[PDB]
Amino acid sequence: ASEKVEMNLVTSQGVGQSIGSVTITETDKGLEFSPDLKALPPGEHGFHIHAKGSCQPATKDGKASAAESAGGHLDPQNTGKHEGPEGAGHLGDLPALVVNNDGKATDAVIAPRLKSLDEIKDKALMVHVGGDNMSDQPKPLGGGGERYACGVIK
């Protein structure tokens, strides 16, 4: 089974233009995330599933913050740690999203720990401005920084 999630730009003032979609499919080796995105800054970007199915801004962190409404990283086991797709932390930690020099992301990625679409229903798929070193050191949540794009999983 699979599901298509449309992604949009987010700012501290709301949700912007659509930048494509990501389709998620259940495979023998876990959930596969096959992006078809454009208009993204080239480089590697933090890619995680957040706890709430909302991309709206919220005023937490000395002001308004883009898609802050989605809460933290999905973690139903309350591990409290950020360790990556192959770690034992947040269940929502996905391998990083690599954007090419044309500003597109088209390479599929796998999360072996996720096994069913049922597990991520009504959650938010997020893309960060910063990367992800899959650790809380030396920067929290892998140095992801601000939220750049977001989509809600129906």
Ligand SMILES: [Cu+2]
């Ligand atoms: Cu995130």
Ligand SMILES: [Zn+2]
């Ligand atoms: Zn995390």
